[PDB]
């Protein structure tokens, strides 16, 4: 619901959704948005659909399908270099989806925008050092850049307070034509605890595990750490629920 609410942010301003201990359905998210592009790194997409991890991180932003190749850790493209970075060590599943016309409560941004370059000038005006985005972190030059970039070619500069470092921070704003249908890119990073897997896919009771299906049959019961051989019979409720 938070992903659906309001409008998707730009790739540099990507919002972060964190799920630690809840049942999750990949199919429900796929139903909400038709997935134009599906890819995963370090694990199968089917495995990601049905597995338990210590934590689930979802990053949601409005990204066009045309520049999807540029936004890759392997890719040397500027958009990945200066905007959004996904940690290589955790398995990362990257999904690009296009909003359906039927879906409502989704607001299209005026245009898709990205930080073309992020750099910091040194104390010497002649010497400049480029700044490369660390994994996530919402981008180093995001503060200078506005949430939506007004022009395809833009110059943003701000002055660092002296000590430290007293060096100008320079950012570039670039935009691409808005698609007739909003396209949103989602980056998912999953962390697995060796002894802890709190977030799990939605669980539906199997017929054999359910007491009602095996009623009237001698069976072995293992409920809440209690193990015994017994026959369950449906009857009027007695005792305290």
């Amino acid at each position, epitope marked *: 619901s938070p992903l659906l609410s309001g409008t998707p942010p730009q790739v540099y301003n990507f919002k972060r959704l964190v799920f630690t201990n809840c049942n999750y359905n990949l199919t429900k998210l796929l139903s909400l948005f038709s997935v134009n592009d599906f890819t995963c790194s370090q694990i199968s997409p089917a495995a990601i659909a049905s597995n338990c991890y210590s934590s689930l991180i979802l990053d949601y932003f409005s990204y066009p399908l045309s520049m999807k190749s540029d936004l890759s850790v392997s890719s040397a493209g500027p958009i990945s270099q200066f905007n959004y970075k996904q940690s290589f060590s955790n398995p990362t599943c990257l999904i690009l989806a296009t909003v359906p016309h039927n879906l409502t409560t989704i607001t299209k941004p005026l245009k898709y925008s990205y930080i*073309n*370059k992020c*750099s910091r*000038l040194l104390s010497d*005006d*002649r010497t*400049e050092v480029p700044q490369l985005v660390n994994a996530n972190q919402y981008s180093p030059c995001v503060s200078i850049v506005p949430s939506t970039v*007004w*022009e*395809d*070619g*833009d*110059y*943003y*500069r701000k002055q660092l307070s002296p000590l430290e470092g007293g060096g*100008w921070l*320079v950012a*570039s*704003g670039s935009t691409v034509a808005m698609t007739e249908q909003l396209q949103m890119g989602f980056g998912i990073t999953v962390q697995y605890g060796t002894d802890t897997n709190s977030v799990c896919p939605k669980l539906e009771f199997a017929n054999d595990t359910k007491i009602a299906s095996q009623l009237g049959n001698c069976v072995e019961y293992s409920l809440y750490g209690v193990s015994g051989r017994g026959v369950f019979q449906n009857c009027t409720a007695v005792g305290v629920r």
Partner: antibody, heavy 120, light 109 residues
Framework: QVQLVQSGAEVKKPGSSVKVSCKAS????????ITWVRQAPGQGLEWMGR????????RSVQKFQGRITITADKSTSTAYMDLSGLTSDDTAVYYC?????????????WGQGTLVTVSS | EIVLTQSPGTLSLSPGERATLSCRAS???????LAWYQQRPGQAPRLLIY???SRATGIPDRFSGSGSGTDFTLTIGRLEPEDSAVYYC?????????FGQGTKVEIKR
């Protein structure tokens, strides 16, 4: 504060590439954009293009697109604009102006200027 | 690109008399996004007002900047022979930024 100077006035045939060079005295370039303005005699100034040497980005006005190539080298500390296949009517004084940024599009300092003449 | 109306231009003004220059805009432009440039004959233009309010550094407060959104007026409290020049109002709110048609102040001692 960086002083702005421009190349001496030059005369070229129409359809012949002409380069106007703007330089900063002391061979030092600050983190400021260089903007090229063409003023026709007795006419309003026209902004041909905006380039930032430190950023390395290049931008041009719609009217002057695909006929002008603008190159600014931060290390050189000199910004030079090349105009190719310009019309005879294009002859005008050319100015280079310091740019605060997209947020602040005003020019604190202006170059002395170069007269460009295109008569065969 | 915004088409902008300008003051008629050449005027006979006595020294010490306030002078007002009109810069109406056909299309609305940001109040904080306008610039005033003064050029002497055979001289490059120099910024007088940035943002249509604050004076540029090294520029006398007499050339005050007033007006917002559509009409921008440059008012000079005291007129001097040095003051006489061509004045252009540039609106940078919309790109391409459009310079003023220009207006000429004439001072005869």
């Amino acid at each position: 504060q960086v002083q702005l100077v421009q190349s001496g006035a030059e005369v070229k045939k129409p359809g012949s590439s002409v380069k106007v060079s703007c330089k900063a005295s002391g061979g030092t370039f600050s983190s400021y954009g260089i903007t090229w303005v063409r003023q026709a005699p007795g006419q309003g100034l026209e902004w041909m293009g905006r380039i930032i040497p430190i950023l390395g980005i290049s931008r041009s006005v719609q009217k002057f697109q695909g006929r002008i190539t603008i190159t600014a080298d931060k290390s050189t500390s000199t910004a030079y604009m090349d105009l190719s296949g310009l019309t005879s009517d294009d002859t005008a004084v050319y100015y280079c102006a310091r740019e605060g940024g997209s947020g602040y599009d005003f020019f604190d300092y202006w170059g002395q200027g170069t007269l460009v003449t295109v008569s065969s | 690109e915004i088409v902008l109306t300008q003051s008629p231009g050449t005027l006979s003004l006595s020294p010490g008399e306030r002078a007002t220059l009109s810069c109406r805009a056909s299309q609305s432009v940001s109040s904080s996004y306008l610039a005033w440039y003064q050029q002497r004959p055979g001289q490059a233009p120099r910024l007088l007002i940035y943002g249509a309010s604050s004076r540029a550094t090294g520029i006398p407060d007499r050339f005050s900047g007033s007006g917002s959104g559509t009409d921008f007026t440059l008012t000079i409290g005291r007129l001097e022979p040095e003051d006489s020049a061509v004045y252009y109002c540039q609106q940078y709110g919309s790109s391409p930024w459009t310079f003023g048609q220009g207006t000429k102040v004439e001072i005869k001692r």
